Design a protein around this ligand. Sequence first.
Ligand SMILES: N[C@@H](Cc1c[nH]c2ccccc12)C(=O)O
Ligand SMILES: N[C@@H](Cc1c[nH]c2ccccc12)C(=O)O
Lengths: 309, 309
Amino acid sequence: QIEIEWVQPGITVTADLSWERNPELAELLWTGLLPYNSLQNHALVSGNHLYHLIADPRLVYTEARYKEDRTKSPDGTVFLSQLQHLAVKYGPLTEYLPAAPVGSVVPEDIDALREAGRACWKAAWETKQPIEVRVRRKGEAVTDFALPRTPPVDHPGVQKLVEEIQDETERVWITPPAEIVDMHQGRIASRAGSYDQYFSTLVFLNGEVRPLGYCALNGLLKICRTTDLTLNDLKRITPTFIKTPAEFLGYTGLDTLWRFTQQVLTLLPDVETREQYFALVNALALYANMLNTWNLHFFPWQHGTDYRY
Amino acid sequence: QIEIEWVQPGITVTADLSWERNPELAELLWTGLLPYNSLQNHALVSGNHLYHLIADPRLVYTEARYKEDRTKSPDGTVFLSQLQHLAVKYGPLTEYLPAAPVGSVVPEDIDALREAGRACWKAAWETKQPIEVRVRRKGEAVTDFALPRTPPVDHPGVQKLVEEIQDETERVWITPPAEIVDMHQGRIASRAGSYDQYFSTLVFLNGEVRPLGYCALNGLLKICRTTDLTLNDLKRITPTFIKTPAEFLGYTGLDTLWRFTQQVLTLLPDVETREQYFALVNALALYANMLNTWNLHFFPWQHGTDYRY
Ligand SMILES: N[C@@H](Cc1c[nH]c2ccccc12)C(=O)O
Ligand SMILES: N[C@@H](Cc1c[nH]c2ccccc12)C(=O)O
């Protein structure tokens, strides 16, 4: 049993964990991930779905034993995905992609859940109020949320950079990053956007950050942990999947993203172990995925009033 | 000397190619790429910048000898890009990323160039009328534009799928794909989009397709051609970068993309040679990059009127 606290709406629900179908994932949440906090997003495509990022690389490569069509899942079902989400269905879904269930919100708490889901939708559609979520073991108080830090690494250069990136990831974990807020308000040093408007810039912002985190960066992580591709080859293929997106994004306004990427690309040829490679890339990957949660939050979805079925 | 003809606005300019700075590039265009047609897009972020797609894998990995800041290039400058573009500056740019020049539209055609530039803008911004560009060696008239096909490959199953995919890419080269048009009109069988709107779906359609093409797929082509990564490893790493994006887009409405990806992923472990790997990923790659051009064309950029600096 776990509790899920949405702070701003002031709603807490309780969910039963199950080791029956996906024991490795249940065990991962129960033992390795809890307790944590995150920025709570609402799905913009999939339907009445809530997901939030968990700052732990294991979610990228841990396999499920059992997946089901998520639209057929009962409301209240809790999932874990390799996009590093914990997810909860609270109403109908259109996205029929397989998902890995690990439990469900107790029957007594479903109304609370749907109510909370609507509060989360309202925040992303209208108010832009960042909604903090706290997840912890049932009946275990926490007054200490801090992002995990990968074990230190025998390399002053790598470790220093890892710490810097992770620190920054924590700093803006539930606090809006200024470089994201600024772009949405048009405060953009480079004036990016054709013909004096920055709407397109926001679409490209929203568009490039997301795959860079979950696809390129997390892909490298997945490959690194689940295959025996050599360190030399990991090092070689990395600039190819991560340089251009970050560079273009740097111009649009993500100076910190692009700065971090340059320092990583700069250190990368000289790392000596797979452990060093992984901490370096993991730190950037989490930073990238963190930014996506804020784009999900801040992007003007409101325009969809003019795009109803 | 080449000729760039924009069909709809009835404008044809002449450009001098130069071997002074990027000989390998100028050569490739001159001997390898001409003549061709394409869909003319206009940059939505970079400024007064025209770019279109060229159906040749060599642009992905052929290296520039020289690059300069594009904001400082004279109006009229022609560039080739590893994004598979021929690009022309016709006014101020804000994107200061380096680009490889290969020539210039002649001085007496600059006015005609800026007319072509503004007309392409009108098509992206307001009209959504597809503009066809035709590019030729000066002198030699051209009647048939067919997409380049990779040389037949000693593997019938691979070769068949390669043919089917290339055929399809050719079919909707300058004629809009129904799957893209239908989505932008809300004709989406899965009703993807939270709370009965499909605007968010259009943002994600736009955002996911582009990196899948230029970053994941094209990245694998470049890795295959510019490094000696083993075939065994090329096959191992491929699904990690291309499955998840394609599956989600399939759900959102791109049935053909997801079907072509699944087929590629089924044949991929059976591939026997690098040449077989290359042709298979290359065909899927171009198709993906082809879809990007239509997203760039059809996405409702006009919303930018509420986002002026
Ligand atoms: N369903 C998420 C987005 C999403 C789900 N799976 C994906 C895979 C790739 C990219 C985006 C996604 C939303 O609507 O907010
Ligand atoms: N210039 C393109 C966008 C672009 C340029 N370079 C990129 C690299 C990655 C992604 C997008 C881009 C436009 O504004 O239309």
